Rosetta silent file (secondary structure, phi, psi, omega in degrees, C-alpha in Angstrom):
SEQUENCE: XXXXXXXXXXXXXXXXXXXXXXXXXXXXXXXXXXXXXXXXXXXXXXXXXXXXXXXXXXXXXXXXXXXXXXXXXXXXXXXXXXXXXXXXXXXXXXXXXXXXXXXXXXXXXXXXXXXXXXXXXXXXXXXXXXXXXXXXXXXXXXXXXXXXXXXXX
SCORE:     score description
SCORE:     0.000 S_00000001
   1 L     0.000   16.955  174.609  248.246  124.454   31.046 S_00000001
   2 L  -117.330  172.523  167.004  250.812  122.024   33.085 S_00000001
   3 L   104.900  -94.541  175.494  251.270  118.404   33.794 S_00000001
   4 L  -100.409  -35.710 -171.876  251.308  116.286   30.503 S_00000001
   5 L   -48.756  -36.604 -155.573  249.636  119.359   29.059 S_00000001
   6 L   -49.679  145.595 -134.397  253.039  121.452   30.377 S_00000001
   7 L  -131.885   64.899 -172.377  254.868  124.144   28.245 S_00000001
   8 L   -13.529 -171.914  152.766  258.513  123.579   28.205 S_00000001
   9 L   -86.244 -165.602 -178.633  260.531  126.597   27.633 S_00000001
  10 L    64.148   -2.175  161.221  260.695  128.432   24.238 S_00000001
  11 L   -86.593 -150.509  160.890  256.863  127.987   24.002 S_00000001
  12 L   176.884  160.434 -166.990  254.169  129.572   25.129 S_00000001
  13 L   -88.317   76.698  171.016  250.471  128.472   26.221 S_00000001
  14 L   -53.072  -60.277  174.022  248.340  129.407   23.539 S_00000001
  15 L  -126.721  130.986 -161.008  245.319  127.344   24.630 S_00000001
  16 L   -15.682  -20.648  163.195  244.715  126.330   27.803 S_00000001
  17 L  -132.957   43.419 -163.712  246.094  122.308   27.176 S_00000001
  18 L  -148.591  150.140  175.656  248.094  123.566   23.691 S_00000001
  19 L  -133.945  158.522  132.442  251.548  125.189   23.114 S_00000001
  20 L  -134.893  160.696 -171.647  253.544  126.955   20.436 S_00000001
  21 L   -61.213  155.181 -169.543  256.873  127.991   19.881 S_00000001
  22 L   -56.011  136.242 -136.917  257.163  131.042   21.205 S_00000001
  23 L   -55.393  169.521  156.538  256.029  134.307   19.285 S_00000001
  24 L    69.695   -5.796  148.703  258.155  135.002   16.491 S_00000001
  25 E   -45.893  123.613  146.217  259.673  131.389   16.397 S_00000001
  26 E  -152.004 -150.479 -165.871  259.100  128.144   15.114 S_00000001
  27 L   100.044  175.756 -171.691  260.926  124.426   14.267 S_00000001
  28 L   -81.251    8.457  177.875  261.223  121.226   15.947 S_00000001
  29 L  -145.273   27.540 -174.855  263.085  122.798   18.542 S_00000001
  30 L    21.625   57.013 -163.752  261.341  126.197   18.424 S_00000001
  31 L  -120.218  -13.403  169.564  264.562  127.539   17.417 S_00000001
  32 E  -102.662  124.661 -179.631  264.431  129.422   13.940 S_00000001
  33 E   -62.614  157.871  176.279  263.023  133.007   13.691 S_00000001
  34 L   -56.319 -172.948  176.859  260.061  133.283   11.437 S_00000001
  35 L  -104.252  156.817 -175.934  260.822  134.762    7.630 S_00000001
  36 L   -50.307  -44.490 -150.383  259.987  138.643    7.542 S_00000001
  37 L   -77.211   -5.022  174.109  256.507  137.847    5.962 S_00000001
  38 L  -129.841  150.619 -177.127  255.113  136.001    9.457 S_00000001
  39 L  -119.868 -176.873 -167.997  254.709  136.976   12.865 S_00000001
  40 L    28.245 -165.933 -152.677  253.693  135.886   16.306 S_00000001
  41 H   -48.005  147.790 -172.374  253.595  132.332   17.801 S_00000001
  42 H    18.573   55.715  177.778  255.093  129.690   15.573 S_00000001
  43 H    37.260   58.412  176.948  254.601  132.350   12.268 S_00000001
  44 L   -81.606  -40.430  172.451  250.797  131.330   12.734 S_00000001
  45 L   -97.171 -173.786 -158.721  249.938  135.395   11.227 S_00000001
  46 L  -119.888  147.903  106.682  250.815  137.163    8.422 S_00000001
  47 L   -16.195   80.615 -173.593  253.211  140.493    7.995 S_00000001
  48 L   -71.027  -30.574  172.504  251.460  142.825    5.728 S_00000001
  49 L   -79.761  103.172  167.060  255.213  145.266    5.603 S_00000001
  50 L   159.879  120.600    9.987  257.633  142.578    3.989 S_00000001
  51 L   -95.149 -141.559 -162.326  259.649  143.052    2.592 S_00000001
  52 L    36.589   42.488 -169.435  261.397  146.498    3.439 S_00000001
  53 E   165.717  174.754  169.441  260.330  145.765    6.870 S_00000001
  54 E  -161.110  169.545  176.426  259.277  143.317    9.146 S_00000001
  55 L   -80.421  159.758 -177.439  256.910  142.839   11.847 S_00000001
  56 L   -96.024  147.392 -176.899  257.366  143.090   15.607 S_00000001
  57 L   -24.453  -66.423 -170.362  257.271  139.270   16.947 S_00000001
  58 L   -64.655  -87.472 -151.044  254.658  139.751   19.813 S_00000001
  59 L   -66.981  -40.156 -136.945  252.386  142.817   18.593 S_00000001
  60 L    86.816   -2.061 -152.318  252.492  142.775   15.291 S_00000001
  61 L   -94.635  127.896 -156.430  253.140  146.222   14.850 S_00000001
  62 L   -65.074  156.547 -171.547  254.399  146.703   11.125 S_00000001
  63 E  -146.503  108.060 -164.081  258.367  148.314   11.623 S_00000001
  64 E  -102.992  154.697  168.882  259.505  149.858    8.157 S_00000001
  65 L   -83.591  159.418 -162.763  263.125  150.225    7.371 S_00000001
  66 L   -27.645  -62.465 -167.818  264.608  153.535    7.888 S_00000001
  67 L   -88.418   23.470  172.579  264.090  155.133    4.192 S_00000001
  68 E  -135.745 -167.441 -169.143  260.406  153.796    3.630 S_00000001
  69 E   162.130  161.666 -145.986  256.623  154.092    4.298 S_00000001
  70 L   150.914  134.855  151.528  253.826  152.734    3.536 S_00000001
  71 L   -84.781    7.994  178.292  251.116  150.363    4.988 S_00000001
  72 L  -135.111   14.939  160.503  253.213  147.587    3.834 S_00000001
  73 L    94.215   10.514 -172.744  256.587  149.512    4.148 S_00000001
  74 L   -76.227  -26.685 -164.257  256.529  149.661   -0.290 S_00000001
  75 E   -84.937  163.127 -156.258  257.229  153.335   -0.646 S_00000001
  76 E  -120.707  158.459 -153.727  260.533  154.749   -0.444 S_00000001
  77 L  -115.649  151.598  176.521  261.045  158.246    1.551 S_00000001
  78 L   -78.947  -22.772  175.297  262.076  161.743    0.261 S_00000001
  79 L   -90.734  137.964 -174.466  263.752  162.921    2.821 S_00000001
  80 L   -60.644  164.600 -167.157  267.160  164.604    3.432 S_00000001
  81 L   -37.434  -66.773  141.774  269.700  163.932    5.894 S_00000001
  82 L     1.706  -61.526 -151.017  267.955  166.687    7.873 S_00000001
  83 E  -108.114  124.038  177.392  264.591  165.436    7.699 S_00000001
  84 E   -78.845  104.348  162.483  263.120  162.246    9.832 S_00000001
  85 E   -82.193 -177.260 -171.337  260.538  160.308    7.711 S_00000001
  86 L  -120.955  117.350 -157.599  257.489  159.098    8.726 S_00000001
  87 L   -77.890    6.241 -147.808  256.629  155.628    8.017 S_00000001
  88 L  -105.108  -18.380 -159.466  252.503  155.950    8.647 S_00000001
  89 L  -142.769  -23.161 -163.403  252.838  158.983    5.547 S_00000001
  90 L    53.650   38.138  167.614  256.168  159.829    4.174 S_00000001
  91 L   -70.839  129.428  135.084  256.118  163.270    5.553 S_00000001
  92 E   -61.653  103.757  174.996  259.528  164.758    6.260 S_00000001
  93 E  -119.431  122.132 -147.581  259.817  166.268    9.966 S_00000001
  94 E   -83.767  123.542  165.697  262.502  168.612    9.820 S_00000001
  95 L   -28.897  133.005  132.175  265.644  169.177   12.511 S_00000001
  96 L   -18.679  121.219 -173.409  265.050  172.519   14.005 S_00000001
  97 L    85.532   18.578 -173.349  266.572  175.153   11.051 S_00000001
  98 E  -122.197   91.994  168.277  265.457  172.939    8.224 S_00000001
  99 E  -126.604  178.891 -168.861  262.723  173.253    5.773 S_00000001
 100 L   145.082  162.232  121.866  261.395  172.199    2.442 S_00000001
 101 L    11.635  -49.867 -162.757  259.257  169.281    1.744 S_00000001
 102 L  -132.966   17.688  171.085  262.228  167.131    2.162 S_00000001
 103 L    50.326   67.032  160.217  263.908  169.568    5.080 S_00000001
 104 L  -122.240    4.605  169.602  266.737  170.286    2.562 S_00000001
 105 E  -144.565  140.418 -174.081  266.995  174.281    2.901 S_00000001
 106 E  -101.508  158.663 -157.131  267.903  175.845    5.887 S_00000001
 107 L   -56.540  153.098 -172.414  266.328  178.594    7.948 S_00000001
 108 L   -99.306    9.348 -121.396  266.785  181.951    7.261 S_00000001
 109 L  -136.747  149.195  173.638  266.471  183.126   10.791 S_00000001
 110 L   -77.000  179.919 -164.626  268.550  184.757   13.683 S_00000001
 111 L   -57.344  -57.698  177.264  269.543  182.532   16.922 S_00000001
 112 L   -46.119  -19.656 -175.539  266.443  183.147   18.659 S_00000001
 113 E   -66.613  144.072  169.413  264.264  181.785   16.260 S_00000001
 114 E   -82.907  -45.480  165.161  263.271  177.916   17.413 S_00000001
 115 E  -171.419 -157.882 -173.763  262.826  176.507   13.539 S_00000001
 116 E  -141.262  148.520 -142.559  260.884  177.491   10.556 S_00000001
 117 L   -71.733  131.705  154.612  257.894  177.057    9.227 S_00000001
 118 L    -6.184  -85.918 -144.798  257.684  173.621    6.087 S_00000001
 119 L   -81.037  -46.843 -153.372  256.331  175.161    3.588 S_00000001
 120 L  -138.409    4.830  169.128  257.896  178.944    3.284 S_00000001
 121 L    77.003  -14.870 -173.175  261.367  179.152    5.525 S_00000001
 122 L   -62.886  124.185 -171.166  259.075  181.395    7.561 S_00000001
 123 E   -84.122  154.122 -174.474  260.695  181.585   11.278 S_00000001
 124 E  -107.748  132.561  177.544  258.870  180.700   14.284 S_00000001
 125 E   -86.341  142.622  165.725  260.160  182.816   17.431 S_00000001
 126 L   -84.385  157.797 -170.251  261.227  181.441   20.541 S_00000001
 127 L   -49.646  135.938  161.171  258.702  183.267   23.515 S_00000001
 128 L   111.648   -5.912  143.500  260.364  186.490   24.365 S_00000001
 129 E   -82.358  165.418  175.626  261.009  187.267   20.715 S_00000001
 130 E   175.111  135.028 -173.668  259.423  189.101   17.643 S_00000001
 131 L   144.218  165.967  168.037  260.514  190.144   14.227 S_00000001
 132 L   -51.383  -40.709  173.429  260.784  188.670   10.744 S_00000001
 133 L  -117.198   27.412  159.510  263.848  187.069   11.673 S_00000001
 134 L    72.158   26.578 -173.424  262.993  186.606   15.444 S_00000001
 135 L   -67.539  -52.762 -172.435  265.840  189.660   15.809 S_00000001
 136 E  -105.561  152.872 -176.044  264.193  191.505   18.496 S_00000001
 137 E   -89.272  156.799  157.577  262.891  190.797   22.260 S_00000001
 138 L   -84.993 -177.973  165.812  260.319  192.010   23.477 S_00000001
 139 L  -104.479  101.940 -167.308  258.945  194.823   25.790 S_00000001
 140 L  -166.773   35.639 -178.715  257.048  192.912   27.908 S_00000001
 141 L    35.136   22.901  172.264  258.912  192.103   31.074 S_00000001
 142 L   116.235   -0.932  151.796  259.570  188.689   29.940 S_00000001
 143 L   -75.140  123.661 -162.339  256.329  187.783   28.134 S_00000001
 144 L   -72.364  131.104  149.005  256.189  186.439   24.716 S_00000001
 145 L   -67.949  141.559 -179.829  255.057  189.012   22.066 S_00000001
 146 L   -53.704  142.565  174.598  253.055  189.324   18.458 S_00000001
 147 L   -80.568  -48.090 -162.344  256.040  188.434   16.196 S_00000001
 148 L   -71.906  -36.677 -155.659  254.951  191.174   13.196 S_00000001
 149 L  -124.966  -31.821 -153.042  254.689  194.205   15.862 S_00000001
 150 L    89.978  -16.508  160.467  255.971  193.485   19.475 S_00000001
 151 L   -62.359  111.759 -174.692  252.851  193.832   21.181 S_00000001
 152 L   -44.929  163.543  176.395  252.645  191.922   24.429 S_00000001
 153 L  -124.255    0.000    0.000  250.637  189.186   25.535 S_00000001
């Protein structure tokens, strides 16, 4: 791919005697990023997330802004400050102490508890705890316990 064939910079060798500007690139001086809706070498593919997104140059790999989801980045996300969304689903995954749908009510739970359950506020213990509200350790020389009773494991 050298000699008269040869691939200044800012290109890249697509085919073995052929250049293009370099992924995400194009112009007579392979100097203006593509528009959102194309990716890789000289915007030769297409950007299925755009707008509210854009593609990554190289891979391809769709990149939604912050507050969407979506396989093309259209939908807009539900979740509270709290709550991370997820761009593949628009699931809300909640800060430790946070639940709801949209991680916008907080845990019910004593220190030991690790977070709480989505759906119900229910607390999850960290090992070496057990109660409703993760109040008591167990008796179990340092072995994590049944949450409802305290029986060792």
């Amino acid at each position: 791919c050298e000699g008269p064939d040869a691939c200044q910079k800012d290109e890249v060798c697509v085919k073995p005697g052929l250049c293009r500007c370099k992924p995400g690139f194009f112009g007579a001086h392979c100097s203006s990023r593509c528009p959102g809706q194309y990716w890789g070498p000289d915007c030769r593919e297409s950007c299925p997330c755009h707008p509210h997104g854009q593609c990554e140059p190289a891979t391809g790999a769709c990149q939604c802004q912050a507050d969407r989801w979506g396989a093309r980045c259209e939908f807009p996300c539900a979740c509270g400050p709290h709550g991370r969304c997820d761009p593949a689903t628009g699931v809300c995954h909640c800060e430790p102490g946070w639940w709801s749908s949209t991680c916008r009510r907080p845990c019910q739970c004593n220190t030991a508890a690790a977070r709480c359950e989505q759906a119900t506020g229910a607390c999850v213990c960290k090992p070496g705890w057990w109660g409703r509200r993760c109040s008591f350790r167990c008796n179990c020389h340092g072995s994590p316990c049944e949450q409802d009773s305290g029986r060792c494991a």
